[PDB]
Structure formats: structure tokens, C-alpha cells
Amino acid sequence: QCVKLNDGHFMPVLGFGTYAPPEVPRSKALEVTKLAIEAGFRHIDSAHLYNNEEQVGLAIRSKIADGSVKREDIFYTSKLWSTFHRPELVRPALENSLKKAQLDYVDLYLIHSPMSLKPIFDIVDLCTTWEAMEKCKDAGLAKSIGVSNFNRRQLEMILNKPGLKYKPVCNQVECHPYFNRSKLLDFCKSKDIVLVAYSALGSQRDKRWVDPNSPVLLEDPVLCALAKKHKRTPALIALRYQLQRGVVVLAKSYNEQRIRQNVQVFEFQLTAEDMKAIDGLDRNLHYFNSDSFASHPNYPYSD
Ligand SMILES: NC(=O)c1ccc[n+]([C@@H]2O[C@H](COP(=O)([O-])OP(=O)(O)OC[C@H]3O[C@@H](n4cnc5c(N)ncnc54)[C@H](OP(=O)(O)O)[C@@H]3O)[C@@H](O)[C@H]2O)c1
Numbered sequence: 001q002c003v004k005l006n007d008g009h010f011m012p013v014l015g016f017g018t019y020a021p022p023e024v025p026r027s028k029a030l031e032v033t034k035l036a037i038e039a040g041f042r043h044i045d046s047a048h049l050y051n052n053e054e055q056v057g058l059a060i061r062s063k064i065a066d067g068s069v070k071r072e073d074i075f076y077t078s079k080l081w082s083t084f085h086r087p088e089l090v091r092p093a094l095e096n097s098l099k100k101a102q103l104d105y106v107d108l109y110l111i112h113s114p115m116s117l118k119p120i121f122d123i124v125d126l127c128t129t130w131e132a133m134e135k136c137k138d139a140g141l142a143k144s145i146g147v148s149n150f151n152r153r154q155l156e157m158i159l160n161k162p163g164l165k166y167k168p169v170c171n172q173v174e175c176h177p178y179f180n181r182s183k184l185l186d187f188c189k190s191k192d193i194v195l196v197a198y199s200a201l202g203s204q205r206d207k208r209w210v211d212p213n214s215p216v217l218l219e220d221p222v223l224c225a226l227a228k229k230h231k232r233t234p235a236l237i238a239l240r241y242q243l244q245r246g247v248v249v250l251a252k253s254y255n256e257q258r259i260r261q262n263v264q265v266f267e268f269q270l271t272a273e274d275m276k277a278i279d280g281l282d283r284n285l286h287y288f289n290s291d292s293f294a295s296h297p298n299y300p301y302s303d
């Protein structure tokens with residue numbers, strides 16, 4: 001199913017994560033994005049950063065061409081990279097992502113991160129970036145626009161902007177049972193802004209930003225015990241948890257069995273006691289924990 005965004009467009013509540021590290025050949029993105037769509041995924045999450053938009057776009061066009069889905073059945077997201085926050089660069093960055101994917105529009109375009117980088121850190125008024133995003137929705141390049149990696153204060157700056165035309169429809173952020181973002185989720189609900197969870201399965205644990213000593217979410221004993229009770233898997237429990245909280249959840253998998261497994265999130269439900277047990281795992285733990293973000297003036301977790 002779908003959630004109605006605050007601009008009247010609809011977003012599928014389970015999305016397919018397409019990021020893979022650079023050691024995975026670029027051709028894999030094409031193959032697994034096809035498999036995801038075959039499995040039942042209708043929301044596909046990509047970004048300029050991922051260096052896969054040509055493959056992801058080809059998978060979508062491929063599944064349109066062979067007749068499995070129509071373009072309006074697919075919800076495709078791309079994201080403005082942090083070297084393109086200066087307002088005059090926004091629309092050209094978007095049109096480029098479009099030309100790569102060979103699509104006429106994205107369903108959603110996000111500001112990937114509030115941490116501006118030189119076109120080295122940069123200082124940009126993200127309110128001007130936002131105006132440029134608004135112009136992209138007006139031109140029909142993006143059906144909806146939103147943000148990613150914004151904390152409550154950063155999100156407030158946009159919402160409070162003089163002559164704001166469109167609220168962000170969502171804030172895509174790190175979110176899972178060890179970092180459940182409860183307070184930010186309540187703030188977003190109060191504003192009819194959807195929270196979209198990434199690393200909802202505990203991240204890819206890439207050594208470039210994640211400490212390998214960090215706990216492994218999918219071996220959590222409470223998650224294992226609920227998977228046993230429901231006869232599902234720890235990943236399924238972690239995804240269902242977000243859906244029942246009114247959180248749109250992404251799931252990356254480049255594995256054919258796990259891709260098909262993940263759409264089973266719709267086939268069962270958790271009780272209030274289950275949800276409380278998961279809620280009790282929260283431990284303020286963000287897996288991405290790197291000097292490369294932490295020292296930025298607009299680091300979202302400076303809290
Ligand atoms: N906005 C941002 O700054 C940001 C940041 C991070 C991620 N994202 C978006 O969110 C997407 C997902 O987040 P993520 O990449 O951190 O990964 P994720 O969804 O947390 O998944 C982490 C690992 O879970 C494994 N997995 C998937 N399904 C599973 C299952 N059923 N059972 C066991 N393991 C399973 C996958 O390994 P296999 O591939 O081997 O199955 C995957 O590498 C990204 O791909 C990207 O689209 C955005």
C-alpha cells in the first residue's frame with residue numbers, strides 16, 4: 001500500500017534501496033532493481049551519489065517495456081548531492097539525474113544532506129536550495145520534493161521560511177530499533193511530513209563509516225525472539241516495526257531470495273507487546289559514525 005503525501009501524491013510504504021558499494025559491479029543494480037520490481041517493490045530509492053542511476057533507470061524502463069508495470073505505477077526517488085546546494089545548480093543536477101535514468105520526471109527529489117560541500121565544506125542558505133527545489137516541482141521535473149538527513153531544527157528552518165510554497169513531503173533519515181527517532185517521528189507526524197527510514201536493517205556496515213564492533217541489528221536477541229514467535233525473520237520484524245509506526249521503510253538487498261522475502265512485510269502484524277519490546281531496544285546508535293560527517297558545521301547529529 002501507499003501513504004498520501006502532504007502535496008496529494010502517493011508514496012509506496014515499502015521502498016527498494018539501490019545503494020551498493022563501489023566494489024559491486026554497476027551491472028548488479030540493473031539486475032536487482034528488475035528483481036525488486038518483479039517481487040512487488042514499486043518504490044525505488046536512488047541518488048546522484050550512488051553512481052547507479054543509468055542502471056536503475058534502465059531496470060525501470062525495462063519493466064515498463066516488457067509490460068509488467070506502467071511508469072505511473074513506479075515511485076522513483078533521486079537526491080541532490082551536497083556539492084549542488086547553491087540554488088542555480090539544483091535544476092541542472094536534477095535534469096542530469098533525469099538524463100542518466102532516461103526518465104521524464106522523478107516522483108521524489110530530496111536534498112540528500114544538510115551538510116553543504118564546496119561546488120572542503122561550504123556555507124549555503126538551504127532555504128535558497130529549497131526555493132530552487134520548489135521551482136523543480138513547479139516545472140514538473142519532480143512530482144514531490146523533500147529532505148534527507150535533516151534534524152528537527154534544520155527541518156524547522158525550511159518550515160518557517162517566509163513565503164514557503166511547498167512543505168517537504170518527507171525526511172529520509174537513519175532509523176531502526178537501535179536509533180528509532182521517536183521524538184523526530186512525532187515532530188514529523190505533527191506536520192504531516194513522512195519519515196522514511198534508511199538502514200532499517202542495520203546498514204551495510206561499510207568499514208568506511210561504520211565501526212565493525214557496532215552491534216549487529218539483525219542478531220538482536222529481541223528481534224530473533226519475535227522472528228521465532230512469528231515464524232518470520234529478524235529483517236521482517238525490523239521492517240514491520242516501521243510500517244506499524246507510520247514510517248515508510250527502505251530495504252536494500254542485492255540477493256534474489258532476500259529481495260523476495262522482504263515484501264512479506266505485508267503478510268503479518270506485530271502486537272502492542274511486540275512493538276513495546278522493539279521500542280525498548282532504542283539506544284541512540286547511528287551506524288554512520290565518521291569524522292567526515294561529525295566535524296561538519298551542519299552535522300545533523302550535533303543534536
Ligand atoms: N538518505 C541517505 O543518506 C541514505 C543513507 C543510507 C541508505 N539510504 C537508502 O536506504 C537504502 C537502504 O539502507 P542501507 O543501504 O543502509 O541498507 P539496509 O536496508 O539497512 O540493509 C542492510 C543489509 O541488510 C541485508 N538484507 C536485506 N534484506 C535482508 C533480509 N531479508 N535478511 C537478512 N539480511 C537482509 C542486505 O544484504 P544483501 O544485499 O546481502 O541482502 C543489506 O546490505 C540504501 O540502499 C539507500 O537507497 C539513504
Ligand SMILES: Cc1ccc(Cl)c(Nc2ccccc2C(=O)O)c1Cl
Binds near residue numbers: 049293
Ligand atoms: C550521515 C549521512 C550523511 C550524508 C549521507 Cl549522504 C549519507 N548517505 C550515504 C553515505 C555513504 C554511503 C551511502 C549513503 C546513502 O545515501 O546511501 C549518510 Cl548515511
